[PDB]
Amino acid sequence: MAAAMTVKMSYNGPPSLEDNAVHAFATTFKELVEKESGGGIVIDLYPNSQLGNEQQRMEQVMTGPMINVASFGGMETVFPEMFATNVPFMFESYAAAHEFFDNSSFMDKAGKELRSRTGIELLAVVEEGGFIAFTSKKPVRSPADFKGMKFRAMDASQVAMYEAFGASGTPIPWTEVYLALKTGVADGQMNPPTYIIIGSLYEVQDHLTLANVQYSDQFLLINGELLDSLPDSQRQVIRKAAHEANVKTRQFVESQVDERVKFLASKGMTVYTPTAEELAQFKELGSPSYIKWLSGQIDTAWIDHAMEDARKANEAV
């Protein structure tokens, strides 16, 4: 009888079920796909960006039968339109973002476009941290404080935001962020507490700013030629399992966000929550600059459509 379908799955960070939201997602996803497909599909897990940096894994998922969990560092290479979903302060809550990423017509449209353009199918927008925070060696309270500073960027949109705040941005691969921050190349970076913990960044950063500037997510990608080659019941399994692992990983992320900040404090990290006025400054200077930069990379219709669907999601909840 025909062999079971073995499908490789690539993603960032260590295989700890306790700290890496993406590893928790993969683990649950593997179990559900195998249970639901009755052994017909087998998911082999490749943690730690083992098989390559963001751009490399994007190449791989486009050319070969596999799964990749990509960050914006990978997504920007073939689909910068997805940046439209990533405007600072776009979502007022985890519920709003879930509503947008699960139901909005933007995501239907973005999904079809990505598939026809790249041969990749988007299965889930994976929440893998709370709202993004800033780290640094010096206190950061407002955009004012960014003047003169060197920040690590994950993607070109992060570069753009730093600049708007008066700092410089430098793309550094995730696996090299600790190095960059210690050897002076960068003073700060942005991430939810999950990644600050998994990268042990508290050793080379001692200020944490809870600006909640962006929704933290990554992207479950599958080679579309693979997915389409599977019998219908196997395709639905992968899709249903992707959503089911997502709703469980969302609980994993959201219910531990306070204890993760508490943890960072106990590792010497001075934690700072911006005042309402300082937030409003982060937004009035951060959102319009972000959209102006993005307008020069993609058709603005994507921006209009994303802002509109975000407004509807914020209001629908």
Q: Nearer to Cl ion by C-beta: 116 or 255? A: 255
- For Cl ion, what does the binding mask look like between residues 127 and 166, x meaning CB under 5 A? --xx------------------------------------
132 within 8 A of 151, measured Cβ to Cβ: no
CB of 29 to Cl ion, least distance (A): 20
- Is residue 61 a contact partner of residue 223, using CB atoms and an 8 Å limit? yes
Among 73, 143, 192, 224, binds Cl ion (CB under 5 A): 192
- 130 vs 143 by CB, closer to Cl ion: 130
Are the CB atoms for 306 and 91 separated by under 8 Å?
A: no
Helix (H) or strand (E) holding 157: helix 156-164
13: contact with Cl ion by CB under 5 A: no
Tokens of 154: 């994950």
CB of 193 to Cl ion, least distance (A): 4
Identity of residue 169: G
Residue tagged 């300082």 (tokens): 278
Alpha helix stretches (DSSP H) within 19-139: 21-36, 54-63, 72-75, 94-103, 105-118
Indicate the residue among 73 and 130 with the shorter CB distance to Cl ion.
Answer: 130
Which range binds Cl ion by CB under 5 A, 22-30, 126-134, 139-147, 279-287? 126-134
Give the residue with the Cβ less far from Cl ion, 193 or 224: 193
Shortest spacing between CB 317 and Cl ion, in angstroms: 20
Q: At closest approach, how far in Å is the CB of 85 from Cl ion?
A: 19
Report 240-259 residues binding Cl ion (CB under 5 A): 257
Q: Which of 50, 51, 57 is nearest to 74 (CA)?
A: 57
Least separation in angstroms between residue 212's CB and Cl ion is 11
CB of 129 or CB of 188, closer to Cl ion: 129
Where residue 286 falls (left for φ over 0; alpha for ψ -120 to 50; beta otherwise) is alpha
Q: In sequence order, which residues have a C-beta less than 8 Å from that of residue 296 and are 6 or more positions away?
A: none
119: left (phi over 0), alpha (psi -120 to 50) or beta: left
Report, in Å, the least distance between residue 94 CB and Cl ion. Answer: 11
Q: Is residue 194 close enough to count as binding Cl ion by CB under 5 A? A: yes
| Residue from the set 88, 193, 199, 274 that interacts with Cl ion by CB under 5 A | 193
Interface with Cl ion (CB under 5 A): 129-130, 192-194, 257, 260
